[PDB]
PDB file of C-alpha atoms and ligand atoms in Angstrom:
ATOM      1  CA  UNK A   1     175.164  28.037  62.815  1.00  0.00           C
ATOM      2  CA  UNK A   2     174.515  29.474  66.279  1.00  0.00           C
ATOM      3  CA  UNK A   3     171.968  32.091  67.249  1.00  0.00           C
ATOM      4  CA  UNK A   4     173.810  35.002  68.837  1.00  0.00           C
ATOM      5  CA  UNK A   5     172.756  37.724  71.257  1.00  0.00           C
ATOM      6  CA  UNK A   6     174.871  40.894  71.518  1.00  0.00           C
ATOM      7  CA  UNK A   7     174.958  43.225  74.557  1.00  0.00           C
ATOM      8  CA  UNK A   8     176.419  46.737  74.685  1.00  0.00           C
ATOM      9  CA  UNK A   9     175.551  49.993  76.455  1.00  0.00           C
ATOM     10  CA  UNK A  10     172.895  52.219  74.886  1.00  0.00           C
ATOM     11  CA  UNK A  11     171.219  54.366  77.549  1.00  0.00           C
ATOM     12  CA  UNK A  12     174.304  53.894  79.690  1.00  0.00           C
ATOM     13  CA  UNK A  13     176.109  55.794  76.931  1.00  0.00           C
ATOM     14  CA  UNK A  14     177.023  55.078  73.303  1.00  0.00           C
ATOM     15  CA  UNK A  15     180.772  55.783  73.600  1.00  0.00           C
ATOM     16  CA  UNK A  16     181.650  52.324  72.181  1.00  0.00           C
ATOM     17  CA  UNK A  17     178.959  52.142  69.446  1.00  0.00           C
ATOM     18  CA  UNK A  18     181.496  51.840  66.581  1.00  0.00           C
ATOM     19  CA  UNK A  19     183.204  48.955  68.375  1.00  0.00           C
ATOM     20  CA  UNK A  20     179.824  47.309  68.909  1.00  0.00           C
ATOM     21  CA  UNK A  21     179.173  47.570  65.177  1.00  0.00           C
ATOM     22  CA  UNK A  22     182.508  45.821  64.531  1.00  0.00           C
ATOM     23  CA  UNK A  23     181.617  43.069  66.985  1.00  0.00           C
ATOM     24  CA  UNK A  24     178.203  42.534  65.404  1.00  0.00           C
ATOM     25  CA  UNK A  25     179.741  42.527  61.917  1.00  0.00           C
ATOM     26  CA  UNK A  26     182.103  39.749  62.956  1.00  0.00           C
ATOM     27  CA  UNK A  27     179.398  37.810  64.810  1.00  0.00           C
ATOM     28  CA  UNK A  28     177.297  37.805  61.609  1.00  0.00           C
ATOM     29  CA  UNK A  29     180.083  35.846  59.905  1.00  0.00           C
ATOM     30  CA  UNK A  30     179.374  32.996  62.340  1.00  0.00           C
ATOM     31  CA  UNK A  31     175.638  33.039  62.943  1.00  0.00           C
ATOM     32  CA  UNK A  32     172.407  34.979  63.224  1.00  0.00           C
ATOM     33  CA  UNK A  33     172.511  38.005  65.558  1.00  0.00           C
ATOM     34  CA  UNK A  34     169.014  37.970  67.075  1.00  0.00           C
ATOM     35  CA  UNK A  35     169.336  41.365  68.741  1.00  0.00           C
ATOM     36  CA  UNK A  36     169.814  43.225  65.448  1.00  0.00           C
ATOM     37  CA  UNK A  37     155.200  48.804  73.197  1.00  0.00           C
ATOM     38  CA  UNK A  38     157.651  51.169  74.864  1.00  0.00           C
ATOM     39  CA  UNK A  39     160.306  49.745  77.116  1.00  0.00           C
ATOM     40  CA  UNK A  40     158.150  46.739  78.044  1.00  0.00           C
ATOM     41  CA  UNK A  41     158.251  45.534  74.434  1.00  0.00           C
ATOM     42  CA  UNK A  42     162.049  45.877  74.401  1.00  0.00           C
ATOM     43  CA  UNK A  43     162.352  43.879  77.622  1.00  0.00           C
ATOM     44  CA  UNK A  44     159.975  41.090  76.579  1.00  0.00           C
ATOM     45  CA  UNK A  45     161.339  40.735  73.056  1.00  0.00           C
ATOM     46  CA  UNK A  46     164.921  40.673  74.287  1.00  0.00           C
ATOM     47  CA  UNK A  47     164.121  38.098  76.976  1.00  0.00           C
ATOM     48  CA  UNK A  48     162.676  35.911  74.208  1.00  0.00           C
ATOM     49  CA  UNK A  49     165.878  36.206  72.166  1.00  0.00           C
ATOM     50  CA  UNK A  50     168.091  35.690  75.188  1.00  0.00           C
ATOM     51  CA  UNK A  51     166.527  32.246  75.786  1.00  0.00           C
ATOM     52  CA  UNK A  52     166.904  31.390  72.094  1.00  0.00           C
ATOM     53  CA  UNK A  53     170.569  32.329  71.905  1.00  0.00           C
ATOM     54  CA  UNK A  54     173.345  29.738  71.708  1.00  0.00           C
ATOM     55  CA  UNK A  55     175.938  32.325  72.837  1.00  0.00           C
ATOM     56  CA  UNK A  56     175.530  35.689  74.578  1.00  0.00           C
ATOM     57  CA  UNK A  57     178.325  38.150  73.732  1.00  0.00           C
ATOM     58  CA  UNK A  58     178.657  41.325  75.805  1.00  0.00           C
ATOM     59  CA  UNK A  59     181.076  44.236  75.534  1.00  0.00           C
ATOM     60  CA  UNK A  60     181.212  45.258  79.192  1.00  0.00           C
ATOM     61  CA  UNK A  61     183.617  48.223  79.173  1.00  0.00           C
ATOM     62  CA  UNK A  62     180.936  50.953  79.336  1.00  0.00           C
ATOM     63  CA  UNK A  63     178.833  50.589  82.520  1.00  0.00           C
ATOM     64  CA  UNK A  64     175.193  49.870  81.743  1.00  0.00           C
ATOM     65  CA  UNK A  65     172.227  48.605  83.759  1.00  0.00           C
ATOM     66  CA  UNK A  66     170.743  46.938  80.697  1.00  0.00           C
ATOM     67  CA  UNK A  67     173.905  45.014  79.869  1.00  0.00           C
ATOM     68  CA  UNK A  68     174.260  43.876  83.470  1.00  0.00           C
ATOM     69  CA  UNK A  69     170.610  42.818  83.600  1.00  0.00           C
ATOM     70  CA  UNK A  70     170.956  40.853  80.346  1.00  0.00           C
ATOM     71  CA  UNK A  71     173.973  39.054  81.795  1.00  0.00           C
ATOM     72  CA  UNK A  72     172.153  38.264  85.064  1.00  0.00           C
ATOM     73  CA  UNK A  73     169.166  36.820  83.214  1.00  0.00           C
ATOM     74  CA  UNK A  74     171.509  34.909  80.887  1.00  0.00           C
ATOM     75  CA  UNK A  75     173.384  33.265  83.775  1.00  0.00           C
ATOM     76  CA  UNK A  76     170.084  32.133  85.250  1.00  0.00           C
ATOM     77  CA  UNK A  77     169.094  30.760  81.833  1.00  0.00           C
ATOM     78  CA  UNK A  78     172.350  28.743  81.854  1.00  0.00           C
ATOM     79  CA  UNK A  79     173.592  30.487  78.709  1.00  0.00           C
ATOM     80  CA  UNK A  80     177.113  30.312  77.373  1.00  0.00           C
ATOM     81  CA  UNK A  81     178.445  33.839  77.875  1.00  0.00           C
ATOM     82  CA  UNK A  82     181.445  35.743  76.510  1.00  0.00           C
ATOM     83  CA  UNK A  83     182.242  39.122  78.082  1.00  0.00           C
ATOM     84  CA  UNK A  84     184.799  41.457  76.502  1.00  0.00           C
ATOM     85  CA  UNK A  85     186.483  44.176  78.585  1.00  0.00           C
ATOM     86  CA  UNK A  86     189.082  46.839  77.699  1.00  0.00           C
ATOM     87  CA  UNK A  87     191.454  47.682  80.599  1.00  0.00           C
ATOM     88  CA  UNK A  88     192.958  50.522  78.555  1.00  0.00           C
ATOM     89  CA  UNK A  89     189.667  52.370  79.152  1.00  0.00           C
ATOM     90  CA  UNK A  90     190.952  53.087  82.656  1.00  0.00           C
ATOM     91  CA  UNK A  91     187.904  51.486  84.256  1.00  0.00           C
ATOM     92  CA  UNK A  92     187.747  48.660  86.755  1.00  0.00           C
ATOM     93  CA  UNK A  93     185.267  46.034  85.597  1.00  0.00           C
ATOM     94  CA  UNK A  94     182.390  45.336  88.001  1.00  0.00           C
ATOM     95  CA  UNK A  95     183.151  42.604  90.518  1.00  0.00           C
ATOM     96  CA  UNK A  96     179.749  41.082  89.674  1.00  0.00           C
ATOM     97  CA  UNK A  97     180.888  40.473  86.080  1.00  0.00           C
ATOM     98  CA  UNK A  98     184.549  39.642  86.757  1.00  0.00           C
ATOM     99  CA  UNK A  99     183.517  37.347  89.614  1.00  0.00           C
ATOM    100  CA  UNK A 100     180.724  35.606  87.682  1.00  0.00           C
ATOM    101  CA  UNK A 101     183.244  34.041  85.298  1.00  0.00           C
ATOM    102  CA  UNK A 102     183.756  30.302  85.691  1.00  0.00           C
ATOM    103  CA  UNK A 103     186.174  30.109  82.757  1.00  0.00           C
ATOM    104  CA  UNK A 104     183.968  27.829  80.649  1.00  0.00           C
ATOM    105  CA  UNK A 105     180.268  28.697  80.388  1.00  0.00           C
ATOM    106  CA  UNK A 106     180.938  32.300  81.512  1.00  0.00           C
ATOM    107  CA  UNK A 107     184.198  33.756  80.205  1.00  0.00           C
ATOM    108  CA  UNK A 108     185.580  37.266  80.682  1.00  0.00           C
ATOM    109  CA  UNK A 109     188.375  38.293  78.310  1.00  0.00           C
ATOM    110  CA  UNK A 110     190.484  41.410  78.723  1.00  0.00           C
ATOM    111  CA  UNK A 111     191.551  42.757  75.347  1.00  0.00           C
ATOM    112  CA  UNK A 112     192.801  45.723  73.309  1.00  0.00           C
ATOM    113  CA  UNK A 113     190.287  47.264  70.899  1.00  0.00           C
ATOM    114  CA  UNK A 114     192.171  46.463  67.680  1.00  0.00           C
ATOM    115  CA  UNK A 115     192.115  42.717  68.380  1.00  0.00           C
ATOM    116  CA  UNK A 116     188.359  42.200  68.801  1.00  0.00           C
ATOM    117  CA  UNK A 117     187.791  40.476  65.427  1.00  0.00           C
ATOM    118  CA  UNK A 118     190.730  38.148  66.033  1.00  0.00           C
ATOM    119  CA  UNK A 119     189.561  37.337  69.555  1.00  0.00           C
ATOM    120  CA  UNK A 120     186.077  36.498  68.292  1.00  0.00           C
ATOM    121  CA  UNK A 121     187.732  34.304  65.643  1.00  0.00           C
ATOM    122  CA  UNK A 122     189.540  32.416  68.407  1.00  0.00           C
ATOM    123  CA  UNK A 123     186.342  31.931  70.420  1.00  0.00           C
ATOM    124  CA  UNK A 124     184.064  30.873  67.543  1.00  0.00           C
ATOM    125  CA  UNK A 125     186.509  28.594  65.659  1.00  0.00           C
TER     126      UNK A 125
ATOM    127  CA  UNK B   1     161.110  42.366 109.420  1.00  0.00           C
ATOM    128  CA  UNK B   2     162.457  41.600 105.951  1.00  0.00           C
ATOM    129  CA  UNK B   3     165.957  40.660 104.915  1.00  0.00           C
ATOM    130  CA  UNK B   4     166.924  43.519 102.600  1.00  0.00           C
ATOM    131  CA  UNK B   5     169.538  43.634  99.848  1.00  0.00           C
ATOM    132  CA  UNK B   6     170.631  47.101  98.679  1.00  0.00           C
ATOM    133  CA  UNK B   7     172.055  47.806  95.190  1.00  0.00           C
ATOM    134  CA  UNK B   8     173.859  50.941  94.053  1.00  0.00           C
ATOM    135  CA  UNK B   9     176.723  51.756  91.686  1.00  0.00           C
ATOM    136  CA  UNK B  10     180.331  51.369  92.896  1.00  0.00           C
ATOM    137  CA  UNK B  11     182.683  50.679  89.965  1.00  0.00           C
ATOM    138  CA  UNK B  12     180.119  52.263  87.662  1.00  0.00           C
ATOM    139  CA  UNK B  13     180.779  55.465  89.625  1.00  0.00           C
ATOM    140  CA  UNK B  14     180.283  56.643  93.223  1.00  0.00           C
ATOM    141  CA  UNK B  15     178.495  59.912  92.419  1.00  0.00           C
ATOM    142  CA  UNK B  16     175.435  58.938  94.510  1.00  0.00           C
ATOM    143  CA  UNK B  17     177.329  57.458  97.472  1.00  0.00           C
ATOM    144  CA  UNK B  18     175.848  59.924  99.999  1.00  0.00           C
ATOM    145  CA  UNK B  19     172.327  59.164  98.840  1.00  0.00           C
ATOM    146  CA  UNK B  20     172.957  55.411  99.108  1.00  0.00           C
ATOM    147  CA  UNK B  21     173.946  55.922 102.761  1.00  0.00           C
ATOM    148  CA  UNK B  22     170.628  57.690 103.383  1.00  0.00           C
ATOM    149  CA  UNK B  23     168.682  54.834 101.792  1.00  0.00           C
ATOM    150  CA  UNK B  24     170.502  52.114 103.727  1.00  0.00           C
ATOM    151  CA  UNK B  25     170.038  54.079 106.951  1.00  0.00           C
ATOM    152  CA  UNK B  26     166.295  54.161 106.372  1.00  0.00           C
ATOM    153  CA  UNK B  27     166.142  50.503 105.277  1.00  0.00           C
ATOM    154  CA  UNK B  28     167.647  49.402 108.612  1.00  0.00           C
ATOM    155  CA  UNK B  29     164.496  50.742 110.284  1.00  0.00           C
ATOM    156  CA  UNK B  30     162.525  48.050 108.424  1.00  0.00           C
ATOM    157  CA  UNK B  31     164.750  44.972 108.432  1.00  0.00           C
ATOM    158  CA  UNK B  32     168.133  43.275 108.256  1.00  0.00           C
ATOM    159  CA  UNK B  33     170.312  44.868 105.558  1.00  0.00           C
ATOM    160  CA  UNK B  34     172.537  42.048 104.290  1.00  0.00           C
ATOM    161  CA  UNK B  35     188.940  34.718  95.734  1.00  0.00           C
ATOM    162  CA  UNK B  36     188.896  38.438  95.020  1.00  0.00           C
ATOM    163  CA  UNK B  37     186.027  39.489  92.785  1.00  0.00           C
ATOM    164  CA  UNK B  38     184.867  35.868  92.772  1.00  0.00           C
ATOM    165  CA  UNK B  39     184.451  35.996  96.559  1.00  0.00           C
ATOM    166  CA  UNK B  40     182.405  39.205  96.235  1.00  0.00           C
ATOM    167  CA  UNK B  41     180.200  37.665  93.562  1.00  0.00           C
ATOM    168  CA  UNK B  42     179.703  34.458  95.539  1.00  0.00           C
ATOM    169  CA  UNK B  43     179.109  36.266  98.855  1.00  0.00           C
ATOM    170  CA  UNK B  44     176.633  38.719  97.352  1.00  0.00           C
ATOM    171  CA  UNK B  45     174.860  35.994  95.364  1.00  0.00           C
ATOM    172  CA  UNK B  46     174.342  34.133  98.646  1.00  0.00           C
ATOM    173  CA  UNK B  47     172.887  37.232 100.322  1.00  0.00           C
ATOM    174  CA  UNK B  48     170.706  37.965  97.343  1.00  0.00           C
ATOM    175  CA  UNK B  49     169.270  34.440  97.524  1.00  0.00           C
ATOM    176  CA  UNK B  50     168.640  35.091 101.252  1.00  0.00           C
ATOM    177  CA  UNK B  51     166.814  38.376 100.657  1.00  0.00           C
ATOM    178  CA  UNK B  52     163.114  39.101 101.015  1.00  0.00           C
ATOM    179  CA  UNK B  53     163.297  42.476  99.225  1.00  0.00           C
ATOM    180  CA  UNK B  54     165.917  43.861  96.821  1.00  0.00           C
ATOM    181  CA  UNK B  55     166.130  47.663  96.727  1.00  0.00           C
ATOM    182  CA  UNK B  56     168.161  49.286  93.959  1.00  0.00           C
ATOM    183  CA  UNK B  57     169.004  52.912  93.293  1.00  0.00           C
ATOM    184  CA  UNK B  58     169.240  52.811  89.504  1.00  0.00           C
ATOM    185  CA  UNK B  59     170.122  56.402  88.568  1.00  0.00           C
ATOM    186  CA  UNK B  60     173.867  55.820  87.984  1.00  0.00           C
ATOM    187  CA  UNK B  61     174.411  53.216  85.224  1.00  0.00           C
ATOM    188  CA  UNK B  62     176.166  50.149  86.618  1.00  0.00           C
ATOM    189  CA  UNK B  63     176.795  46.624  85.354  1.00  0.00           C
ATOM    190  CA  UNK B  64     176.780  45.232  88.888  1.00  0.00           C
ATOM    191  CA  UNK B  65     173.431  46.774  89.799  1.00  0.00           C
ATOM    192  CA  UNK B  66     171.898  45.519  86.567  1.00  0.00           C
ATOM    193  CA  UNK B  67     173.330  42.041  87.169  1.00  0.00           C
ATOM    194  CA  UNK B  68     171.982  41.962  90.726  1.00  0.00           C
ATOM    195  CA  UNK B  69     168.530  42.898  89.426  1.00  0.00           C
ATOM    196  CA  UNK B  70     168.660  40.211  86.727  1.00  0.00           C
ATOM    197  CA  UNK B  71     169.686  37.525  89.214  1.00  0.00           C
ATOM    198  CA  UNK B  72     167.069  38.796  91.669  1.00  0.00           C
ATOM    199  CA  UNK B  73     164.281  38.414  89.113  1.00  0.00           C
ATOM    200  CA  UNK B  74     165.302  34.843  88.388  1.00  0.00           C
ATOM    201  CA  UNK B  75     165.540  34.162  92.154  1.00  0.00           C
ATOM    202  CA  UNK B  76     161.853  35.266  92.353  1.00  0.00           C
ATOM    203  CA  UNK B  77     162.643  38.182  94.642  1.00  0.00           C
ATOM    204  CA  UNK B  78     160.515  41.235  95.383  1.00  0.00           C
ATOM    205  CA  UNK B  79     162.239  44.269  93.802  1.00  0.00           C
ATOM    206  CA  UNK B  80     162.011  48.060  94.332  1.00  0.00           C
ATOM    207  CA  UNK B  81     163.969  50.329  91.955  1.00  0.00           C
ATOM    208  CA  UNK B  82     164.460  54.056  92.574  1.00  0.00           C
ATOM    209  CA  UNK B  83     165.310  56.470  89.740  1.00  0.00           C
ATOM    210  CA  UNK B  84     165.911  60.243  89.785  1.00  0.00           C
ATOM    211  CA  UNK B  85     164.774  62.149  86.662  1.00  0.00           C
ATOM    212  CA  UNK B  86     166.791  65.127  87.952  1.00  0.00           C
ATOM    213  CA  UNK B  87     169.831  63.195  86.671  1.00  0.00           C
ATOM    214  CA  UNK B  88     168.737  64.041  83.123  1.00  0.00           C
ATOM    215  CA  UNK B  89     169.145  60.387  82.150  1.00  0.00           C
ATOM    216  CA  UNK B  90     166.682  58.091  80.441  1.00  0.00           C
ATOM    217  CA  UNK B  91     166.508  54.948  82.564  1.00  0.00           C
ATOM    218  CA  UNK B  92     167.480  51.677  80.847  1.00  0.00           C
ATOM    219  CA  UNK B  93     164.609  50.032  78.977  1.00  0.00           C
ATOM    220  CA  UNK B  94     165.636  46.761  80.614  1.00  0.00           C
ATOM    221  CA  UNK B  95     164.844  48.109  84.072  1.00  0.00           C
ATOM    222  CA  UNK B  96     161.845  50.270  83.201  1.00  0.00           C
ATOM    223  CA  UNK B  97     160.519  47.427  81.008  1.00  0.00           C
ATOM    224  CA  UNK B  98     161.045  44.691  83.613  1.00  0.00           C
ATOM    225  CA  UNK B  99     158.619  46.428  85.982  1.00  0.00           C
ATOM    226  CA  UNK B 100     155.186  44.944  86.560  1.00  0.00           C
ATOM    227  CA  UNK B 101     153.972  47.475  89.153  1.00  0.00           C
ATOM    228  CA  UNK B 102     153.718  44.845  91.909  1.00  0.00           C
ATOM    229  CA  UNK B 103     156.609  42.480  92.607  1.00  0.00           C
ATOM    230  CA  UNK B 104     158.972  44.575  90.410  1.00  0.00           C
ATOM    231  CA  UNK B 105     158.344  48.305  90.953  1.00  0.00           C
ATOM    232  CA  UNK B 106     160.253  51.221  89.374  1.00  0.00           C
ATOM    233  CA  UNK B 107     159.644  54.597  91.033  1.00  0.00           C
ATOM    234  CA  UNK B 108     160.727  57.989  89.789  1.00  0.00           C
ATOM    235  CA  UNK B 109     161.502  60.195  92.786  1.00  0.00           C
ATOM    236  CA  UNK B 110     163.071  63.463  93.934  1.00  0.00           C
ATOM    237  CA  UNK B 111     166.054  63.098  96.261  1.00  0.00           C
ATOM    238  CA  UNK B 112     164.429  64.995  99.130  1.00  0.00           C
ATOM    239  CA  UNK B 113     161.552  62.506  99.378  1.00  0.00           C
ATOM    240  CA  UNK B 114     163.413  59.179  99.378  1.00  0.00           C
ATOM    241  CA  UNK B 115     162.832  58.552 103.093  1.00  0.00           C
ATOM    242  CA  UNK B 116     159.096  59.185 102.722  1.00  0.00           C
ATOM    243  CA  UNK B 117     158.904  56.941  99.660  1.00  0.00           C
ATOM    244  CA  UNK B 118     160.610  54.117 101.561  1.00  0.00           C
ATOM    245  CA  UNK B 119     158.300  54.702 104.551  1.00  0.00           C
ATOM    246  CA  UNK B 120     155.326  54.272 102.209  1.00  0.00           C
ATOM    247  CA  UNK B 121     156.628  51.112 100.526  1.00  0.00           C
ATOM    248  CA  UNK B 122     157.532  49.454 103.833  1.00  0.00           C
ATOM    249  CA  UNK B 123     154.382  50.697 105.626  1.00  0.00           C
TER     250      UNK B 123
HETATM  251  O1  LIG C   1     167.035  51.028  72.991  1.00  0.00           O
HETATM  252  C1  LIG C   1     167.306  49.779  73.554  1.00  0.00           C
HETATM  253  N1  LIG C   1     167.362  48.742  72.730  1.00  0.00           N
HETATM  254  C2  LIG C   1     167.620  47.534  73.221  1.00  0.00           C
HETATM  255  C3  LIG C   1     167.846  47.357  74.587  1.00  0.00           C
HETATM  256  C4  LIG C   1     168.162  45.939  75.143  1.00  0.00           C
HETATM  257  N2  LIG C   1     169.616  45.739  75.409  1.00  0.00           N
HETATM  258  C5  LIG C   1     170.138  46.460  76.776  1.00  0.00           C
HETATM  259  C6  LIG C   1     171.422  46.776  76.558  1.00  0.00           C
HETATM  260  C7  LIG C   1     171.609  48.357  76.695  1.00  0.00           C
HETATM  261  O2  LIG C   1     171.157  48.678  77.999  1.00  0.00           O
HETATM  262  P1  LIG C   1     171.158  50.240  78.451  1.00  0.00           P
HETATM  263  O3  LIG C   1     172.577  50.766  78.310  1.00  0.00           O
HETATM  264  O4  LIG C   1     170.230  50.954  77.494  1.00  0.00           O
HETATM  265  O5  LIG C   1     170.712  50.206  79.887  1.00  0.00           O
HETATM  266  C8  LIG C   1     171.819  46.337  75.088  1.00  0.00           C
HETATM  267  O6  LIG C   1     172.605  45.229  75.117  1.00  0.00           O
HETATM  268  C9  LIG C   1     170.452  46.119  74.415  1.00  0.00           C
HETATM  269  C10 LIG C   1     167.770  48.452  75.466  1.00  0.00           C
HETATM  270  C11 LIG C   1     167.504  49.697  74.924  1.00  0.00           C
HETATM  271  C12 LIG C   1     167.423  50.979  75.782  1.00  0.00           C
HETATM  272  O7  LIG C   1     167.720  50.705  77.138  1.00  0.00           O
HETATM  273  O1  LIG C   2     183.276  46.469  95.672  1.00  0.00           O
HETATM  274  C1  LIG C   2     182.038  45.844  95.445  1.00  0.00           C
HETATM  275  N1  LIG C   2     181.291  45.457  96.472  1.00  0.00           N
HETATM  276  C2  LIG C   2     180.113  44.869  96.273  1.00  0.00           C
HETATM  277  C3  LIG C   2     179.649  44.654  94.975  1.00  0.00           C
HETATM  278  C4  LIG C   2     178.264  43.963  94.755  1.00  0.00           C
HETATM  279  N2  LIG C   2     177.223  44.961  94.395  1.00  0.00           N
HETATM  280  C5  LIG C   2     177.263  45.452  92.829  1.00  0.00           C
HETATM  281  C6  LIG C   2     176.763  46.680  92.821  1.00  0.00           C
HETATM  282  C7  LIG C   2     177.853  47.723  92.288  1.00  0.00           C
HETATM  283  O2  LIG C   2     178.199  47.217  91.002  1.00  0.00           O
HETATM  284  P1  LIG C   2     179.352  48.023  90.170  1.00  0.00           P
HETATM  285  O3  LIG C   2     178.952  49.452  90.000  1.00  0.00           O
HETATM  286  O4  LIG C   2     180.652  47.962  90.994  1.00  0.00           O
HETATM  287  O5  LIG C   2     179.406  47.304  88.852  1.00  0.00           O
HETATM  288  C8  LIG C   2     176.381  47.095  94.309  1.00  0.00           C
HETATM  289  O6  LIG C   2     175.037  47.013  94.499  1.00  0.00           O
HETATM  290  C9  LIG C   2     177.161  46.062  95.152  1.00  0.00           C
HETATM  291  C10 LIG C   2     180.432  45.043  93.879  1.00  0.00           C
HETATM  292  C11 LIG C   2     181.657  45.668  94.123  1.00  0.00           C
HETATM  293  C12 LIG C   2     182.590  46.144  92.982  1.00  0.00           C
HETATM  294  O7  LIG C   2     181.987  45.898  91.721  1.00  0.00           O
END
């Protein structure tokens, strides 16, 4: 069973918090979600988990410095990465996330919110 | 004269675009300011590897700015982040918590003083 790291906006805004809870609930079916002192403790503890993770899953619809930073560190750690983006939000996903995808180790999937459990099923089965 | 890489929100929102222009204008006094989205990512990743200092205005939340800062840390780059409390926001723990006060600095500042702050950092 893989160790999993979930990323989603917090101080960038909690608009998608209920969706994040759905994603984490589904990820727990497959493995251990590691992400579930001030800000330094948060950074250091999360960097520890990010190196431990087998897969990094990020919901990248809501813009967030912390999510982007986690993804940048994860790429440099050579982590397998799954990013999930909702075009129906009306946003354009950052070129630094869209353009980081190599289609294998770093995947970016566009999706509709109702399908997120099914999409995670497809990725983790 | 350093090679300088500037970061500021675009697709996260262009609210601070005028301020970014002021920062880049002042940075040029101190050094060189360096398909599809893949070309942008690859181009900018090359510049960021070529940089001596990465300067980021981190007030507007942005995936791309955060990603640039994460890649910059792993590229062992010198980093200066600039945050405005007048925005009313609480800056990301990942940026505030990455700071070490030396090679990764996070400064709170008021918009009117950004040129003086840059003058101080770049001597
Ligand atoms: O309270 C927190 N708990 C845990 C974290 C670590 N990551 C960052 C990212 C949100 O980044 P952001 O939107 O907050 O910038 C999430 O994936 C969790 C950050 C904070 C506050 O930053
Ligand atoms: O058009 C572009 N030109 C150049 C870039 C590279 N960086 C990312 C960051 C903004 O990131 P973001 O807010 O767009 O996510 C800026 O520092 C420039 C990204 C885009 C569109 O993403």
